[PDB]
Amino acid sequence: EVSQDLFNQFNLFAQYSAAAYCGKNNDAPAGTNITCTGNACPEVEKADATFLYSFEDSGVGDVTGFLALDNTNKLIVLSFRGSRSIENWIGNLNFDLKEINDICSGCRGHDGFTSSWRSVADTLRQKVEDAVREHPDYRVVFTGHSLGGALATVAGADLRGNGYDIDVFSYGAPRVGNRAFAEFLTVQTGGTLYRITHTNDIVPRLPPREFGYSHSSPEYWIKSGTLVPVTRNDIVKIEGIDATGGNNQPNIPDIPAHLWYFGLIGTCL
Amino acid sequence: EVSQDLFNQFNLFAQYSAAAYCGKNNDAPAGTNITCTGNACPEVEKADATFLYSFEDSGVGDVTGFLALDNTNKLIVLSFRGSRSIENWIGNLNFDLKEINDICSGCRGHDGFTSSWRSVADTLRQKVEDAVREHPDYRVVFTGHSLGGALATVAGADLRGNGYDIDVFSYGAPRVGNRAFAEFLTVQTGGTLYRITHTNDIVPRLPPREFGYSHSSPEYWIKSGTLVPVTRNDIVKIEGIDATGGNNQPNIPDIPAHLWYFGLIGTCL
Ligand SMILES: *[C@@H]1O[C@H](CO)[C@@H](O)[C@H](O)[C@H]1NC(C)=O
Ligand SMILES: *[C@@H]1O[C@H](CO)[C@@H](O)[C@H](O)[C@H]1NC(C)=O
Ligand SMILES: [Mg+2]
Ligand SMILES: [Mg+2]
């Protein structure tokens, strides 16, 4: 029974996430208005929102995304793009873990996702801190769909505790590491993670539990269909690390369900 | 206005049109159930609907689509697919008109669309007539999106007046010929043409009028945006050969608006 207010924020960061794929320019000047093709982010376009910094193929893991200033919603938004070819990304996904003791003790995380974040963290923390110091009453939100949602979760876990709260809104994010990391992500203070999933989306089911992966609690499960508008009654809050009955159900998953989080996402008309 | 009953046919033939692209099965042997990926054609899935015949790269013009038997709605549906690559197809669209005296006197048609149809006409007329002879109380409906909307319109014009009505439902169809042809399609007896357009979709604006092309009347104009659900009152019936104030407006057109007719069409999640 999610609040009307939190539902409206789920929609907004779904569109910031979507905007990471469908942004008008990929070399866009800082200060230029955020717009999308194909009506992928109308709520963002309604806002007084601008690009503070745009990154494409950035650092080791070819990280793509933007830092946005929203003067209407009073947000600093760091949005990470998922893969440009999601089916190929899924098939090629490695299940290798790595120590991430610098984020939390005994925590391990997907090699790729944690590597990629580490390679751009210094730059993006600096950009985020300039924004905080220029706009101290502005709320920091990190967001991402798919791979982008993994990056956003890792970055949030990493940069929390340094003076600014960081909310994270992840959309069809894969598992990011082991049970220790899931437990950290579940109780870490200095912001809330809203880990959002849809029906039988394949990506939150990877990498598999059998390779040493766990999901953080809680889960915000969208049970309304692919290409169906989402009502507030359509979101189910599921508590427990590796809880089942949401997206973690013993049935055949689906790629199309990955591309529909409140609206079209991870692809551009 | 349009009745709720007509709004439901528009939504059903939009999904029969969508299925020409997202047809879950290309194996697709006669008698197999119609299903789509990505929730593209749920109303078709609900119906007892089967492939009577399926064609790919058919004839000179490489016509693709299927002939369906629907025992729930009692339909014989010929569904033509538009292009695999609509943006490429829009850019390479040649405006050459061909004499089509054979279908109506003084009529000229798009050389491509009319040549394409003529090359599969004998084979496909025999398949509909076979289907009509076994199910004479069934309604014959030709439908398609984009290039598919044009093929259906030409097929309709050509095969009508042979003992069965042919209703045509086109989605974002281009202009198919000159004013003589547009007039023939406005008054032809032996079924109705439902020519449906969306906001500022580019495709119903091609080929241009200044290449001697005209639209048949009427036009059913969807005013609701891209990725927005369509309500009955969002559809405006616009009367008049080459009427303006629907899709035929002197503003900047849009490709994404081509891919949203009631839902996702001409593309498959
Ligand atoms: C950018 O957005 C601002 C605030 O939303 C608006 O007032 C201005 O007209 C926009 N600039 C451009 C280039 O459209
Ligand atoms: C096809 O649909 C029919 C009628 O709705 C049904 O009897 C049958 O179970 C379906 N076939 C398959 C392969 O699902
Ligand atoms: Mg704006
Ligand atoms: Mg016409």
Residue numbers in the entry:
A (entry chain B), B (entry chain A): 1 to 269
The authors write:
Initial hits were obtained by the capillary counterdiffusion technique using 0.82 M K/NaH2PO4, 0.1 M Hepes, pH 7.5 (C23 of the CSK screening kit) or 5.0 M sodium formate in 100 mM AcNa pH 7.0 as precipitating agents. Protein and precipitant concentrations were optimized using the batch method while keeping the agarose concentration at 0.1% (w/v). Therefore, the final optimized batch experiments consisted of 500 mL of a protein solution (final concentration of BioL 15 mg·mL–1) in 0.1 M K/NaH2PO4, 0.1 M Tris pH 7.0, and 0.2% (w/v) agarose. Using this condition, we obtained crystals of size ranging from 8 to 20 μm, with 8 ± 2.52 μm being the most abundant at almost 50% of the sample. Interestingly, the only common phosphate-ion moiety among both models did not match their position but appears 2.9 Å apart. Although BioL was crystallized in its closed-lid form, the enzyme was active in water and organic media.
